Amino acid sequence: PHSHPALTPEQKKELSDIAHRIVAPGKGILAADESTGSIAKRLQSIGTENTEENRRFYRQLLLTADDRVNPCIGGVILFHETLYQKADDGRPFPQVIKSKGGVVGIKVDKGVVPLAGTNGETTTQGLDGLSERCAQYKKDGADFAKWRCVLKIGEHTPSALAIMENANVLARYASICQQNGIVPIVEPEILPDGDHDLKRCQYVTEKVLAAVYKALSDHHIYLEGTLLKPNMVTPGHACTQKYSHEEIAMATVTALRRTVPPAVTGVTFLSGGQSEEEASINLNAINKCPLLKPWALTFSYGRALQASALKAWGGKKENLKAAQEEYVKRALANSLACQGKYTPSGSNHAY
Amino acid sequence: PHSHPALTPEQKKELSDIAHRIVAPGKGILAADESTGSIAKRLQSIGTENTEENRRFYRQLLLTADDRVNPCIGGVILFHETLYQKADDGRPFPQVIKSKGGVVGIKVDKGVVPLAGTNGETTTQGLDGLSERCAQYKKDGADFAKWRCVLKIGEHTPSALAIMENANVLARYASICQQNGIVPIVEPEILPDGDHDLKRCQYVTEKVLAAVYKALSDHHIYLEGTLLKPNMVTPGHACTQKYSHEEIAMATVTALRRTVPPAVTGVTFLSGGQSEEEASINLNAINKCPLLKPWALTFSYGRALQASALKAWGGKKENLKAAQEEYVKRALANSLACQGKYTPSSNHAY
């Protein structure tokens, strides 16, 4: 029961300032950290060869969008490769991001791995040599990191083991990041797969988040210098019962209010399988919810910010402006939504 | 995991409505639940025989103060004996409290017991037949309960066992209370005993509360239907280093912001060994702290609300007015304090 300060006042100040800048009023996060294997499907969906040059061009297309996105983007998550690529003018992408007012982020996990003795459950790896990697990323321009854990709702999942293990690994990851001046974004994604209803998702989300914050406490994590990337609370994809955006918002905010300490600087929602417009409407409803919300509630979207842009680009250089135009539109929409000012024009006890 | 609703929407509403009434803006709790074993020294200090009539009288004195205390008192915690006593006009004390706009609370724990294998640490008993007792107290006018767990800061304390066990018993007590329409006030008190500094108290407080809320979650506790009664974050009673009220407020608010979910309806601070004035000044500083506080931050005082009243009374029936006056004075001082409107007469370093 003795304190051996993991961080000095200066380190804490640096971490808190970074966290607040990322989620400042009206700003969200662009998740463009798709791996070479993940971006493969995206490129094949528009008949484009998956080469480093095409990946560079696509990332550049998004990162160099006009100044309208500046007040919309507080952070950009990149994959290792992209962090070391440069725009046509020779400027490193991280420099491009920063010049537009954004904070640079880096995915540091090494994917999921199966947990033996479970019903298809997983944990996430990537702690080995993480400290050295974080130190190097920090020096090369990154100020926050991304690590994704995945849990699934089923007849016997998430199990006590899966919940405990994933929460523990997220805590180790956050601890290492903070020692290197990197703001860790804690991401305990609960998949929407299944036919469960809204109440089930809320229940599981509340249990998962409770475990997550207890682990962060056990590992002496500085909450003010962290962000949370949870799933919104929604029914399963195969759920027959229909719900309004107001219900999704109330269930989501209620779950968060019951588990997330106010010290947490911000919540950057993942959109999962939601469409671009759906992700904006729900994020807006969440911000409109008539309950006290002590943390910034914004976005960290990948598919919900690029979907149309990728399609508009089609891998043709001539559609550059049209592609960027699609991305900018979603950036503005979500900027308004994370403020509860979004519009298509441009009982609590039951939870 | 799988859900099996512990409460219906109707039961949740009842509990949440009660919790909010107790900590309504400007209101706090009067802790007058001293057991016959604790009230003994109180009466002894004023040379008064510890009889049932004298205890009944003293309680009446506090409970029947003029209407100036009404806006200040959201709840009153009573000891079993008192819940069944009556004022001179024949009215049961629970009726007297309610008629003044207050909610009636009842202590339900059965005191602390030693934890074997620890350095003088304890847990708290009182769960046996608690459900039946709560059902009866509810029928007899009580809407909330009190249960006190005690932890101590020392070289090897609080130990992992003490923290886990006390957090678990609080969760059990909370669960049983809510099943009976009684709002449980979770009280995990960390004593000020010792010469530890402010930073040490904040660290321990943070660890204890994280454990308390994880336990409440494990036992499916409805937080909106609960209140928290923690110690403020202050240096040890014998700490050589000195701090300002602002530092105590910052350390306290920070600790809470890092561990207490916004869903918790309110925090009713215990004053520990602080004086009446000090308790009011710190609560005021806490409410003036430049950090976001998603829960009501008020009081649940015993000594800090009765110290002077008890002294002015002195066991003499002719000092009723004088005594009640002192009580009213502190009630008013704290009602303003829990709003940051009281005046006597870098956060990254936390």
Added chain:
Amino acid sequence: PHSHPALTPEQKKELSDIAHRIVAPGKGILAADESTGSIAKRLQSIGTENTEENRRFYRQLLLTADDRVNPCIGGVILFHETLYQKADDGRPFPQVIKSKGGVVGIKVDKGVVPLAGTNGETTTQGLDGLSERCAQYKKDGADFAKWRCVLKIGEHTPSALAIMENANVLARYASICQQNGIVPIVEPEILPDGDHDLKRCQYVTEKVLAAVYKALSDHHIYLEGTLLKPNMVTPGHACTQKYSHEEIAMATVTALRRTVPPAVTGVTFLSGGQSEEEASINLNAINKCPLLKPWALTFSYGRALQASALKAWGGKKENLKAAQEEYVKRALANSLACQGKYTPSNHAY
């Protein structure tokens, strides 16, 4: 962590000595601690008015059985009421038990209570004032205690909450008992209700026992001064798959070997819904199981020792000898069983 001795060397010796005496070779436990409310159904099945008198007589009938049971019974669990009753000759029941070489035990739990937010699960109450009660029971002849926790196998049970809470309360109870010179018998019973199979019971039993011993460790319990009373590992009552006694034994011994520390003095199996013969046959197979067992494997039976005796008695004092004879036969059968010498009339785990 830091050590703050919960017990002195002398206290440890007393507890260990008591534990070993109870489960000494060939000895088991007669569980006769049925509460007046629980015994009511028993006396009802034999048209006998449930009165303190008839309860005293029935208990006397069992406690005063001939000396053939002496080497079979190492301990007797009594209900509060019985601990203070006397035989016709005036001898206090505890004295009767001890004279026959048995250790006196006392039930100290106050029954199960529902756990809100669970699918019909429970925890057990009884810790309030337990220290004072144990000290009084010790002064009055008791050397060990019984506390029963109950878990059930279902679609969502036993839940993490139920497992954690029951293991924790068991540790609290054990801690308090040891502080008063009383050997605590930890009983985490997993009901046989349901249609689950053998491996499902084995799995749950293993998880439950692992939780139980972690809790005992967290609470600084002196294992050598304790006994474990678990269910045998068997398929659910409604399971359609059939198993042999050798399979039940293998599953049972395997489960214990993977969770119970060698330091535990002995395992006193509860018989659950098993008949008298079934309980003896299974205990025998368990003791014959090839695997190495570092603890005594015996019985702590209530229904499996009294069934026939109760029926033979029928509330008629005239049936005293006939009734006692039935009890003696089961006592003898199980004494041989806990030694693997009873005869009526492993990677797959």
Added chain:
Amino acid sequence: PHSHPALTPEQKKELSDIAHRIVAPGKGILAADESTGSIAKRLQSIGTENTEENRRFYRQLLLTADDRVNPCIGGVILFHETLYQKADDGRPFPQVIKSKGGVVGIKVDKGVVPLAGTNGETTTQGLDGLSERCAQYKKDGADFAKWRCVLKIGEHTPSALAIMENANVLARYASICQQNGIVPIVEPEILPDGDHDLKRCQYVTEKVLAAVYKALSDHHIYLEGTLLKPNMVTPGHACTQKYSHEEIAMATVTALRRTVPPAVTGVTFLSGGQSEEEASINLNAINKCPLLKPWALTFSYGRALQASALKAWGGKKENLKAAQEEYVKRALANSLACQGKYTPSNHAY
């Protein structure tokens, strides 16, 4: 909880058979997996240049000792580099070890890393891509693995965090190993550093092992397919109070009896900072301890088996026989020690 078999009966059989062969009667383990960073200081002590050839030669010297060590060595732990080196006759070292009746082990952890917010405490890394590494090591002759976690006794250590985190990572490591047919040796080493006495080390050891076994249960680890490599229970190196070998054996065996399930196939002790003789004498006493021990109690020595050998070699190729002779002597002594055949008041525990 619901069962989702981590292993098939076939997989369990393979792991169990491997574990039993490593600790077969009279057999122990040679720990020659010194990291290239640790071996450097060893070669330095004998003015020998730290080259790949010298390292290869030294390992060859130990692995090619006369047949007298065959009955003594059940397993040999190797570092990655050595696993792929060959003897002068072209035979890969794994083949050499196997031809002498030994099982090949491989160190798979990637060292300790600091735990932020603690008083100099650490956890261990090495899980990333461990499954693929294990599958490859299995194909290359390895049947068991080594992973070391380190805890220290102090005023505020081991902390709740250090214990929990280290037990958890050990469990993750063991799970991945068993999925690849590799027997994991769980090594939660508690350093002897400090002035604490015997009872303090025993207390901490019991708390650590209880946490370790709860974690292995939570992670569904097959205990019969695992081995435990703990520190012997001894006072700190700077402790004033002196203890006899019998007391060390008693405290050590008591700690294990109170925490290690009988299902664990064997305990392979690390010698810490003990001398070659000290390590053999203590192991002998442990095996002679009166208490019941349901698991094999043997050795997994590095310094305690190589000390004299390394000195006799001195980097001189002509001192091969002399060096090997020193190793053989220690292997023979320890082979007898793990049988309690070597000769150069339990309630108080």
